[PDB]
Ligand binder design. Sequence first.
Ligand SMILES: [Cl-]
Ligand SMILES: [Cl-]
Ligand SMILES: [Mg+2]
Ligand SMILES: [Mg+2]
Length: 154
Amino acid sequence: NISGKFIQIRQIAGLNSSLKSSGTFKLTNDGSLLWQQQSPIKTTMQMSKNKLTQTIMDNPPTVLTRDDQPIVFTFTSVFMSVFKGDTKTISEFFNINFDGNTQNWTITLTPKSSPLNKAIKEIILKGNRYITNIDVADTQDNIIKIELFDITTN
Ligand SMILES: [Cl-]
Ligand SMILES: [Cl-]
Ligand SMILES: [Mg+2]
Ligand SMILES: [Mg+2]
């Protein structure tokens, strides 16, 4: 399994500040992701058996869908795919550009087609041994910037 920490910074066009959050993630032996936001408000996302669910604070969980939550759904799928090296699946949905080397690389993903290209402008991944940064730009001038750190494989 792979676990780590994240800081997320959301830059929304038209807001005069960025929205910051942070937490942990765990990729388990069985193809599951547990994403736990711990600050400033607790939320949890889980991908298990290709089902994506989210819990906000103590509220009941809901299912997130490709159709209604395309950016989150795609982020989560790409995240899992890159950690397991599954560029085959990524390539079904994205053009892939790779620049760099094992110590410093950047992967640029642009969507091949609709409907994904109605929601996502590009996803940029940067890293070394692991992903260190993920930027998700939508088609409406908003950008989510995620930093991953304290990643350990055990
Ligand atoms: Cl639901
Ligand atoms: Cl979304
Ligand atoms: Mg729907
Ligand atoms: Mg980043």
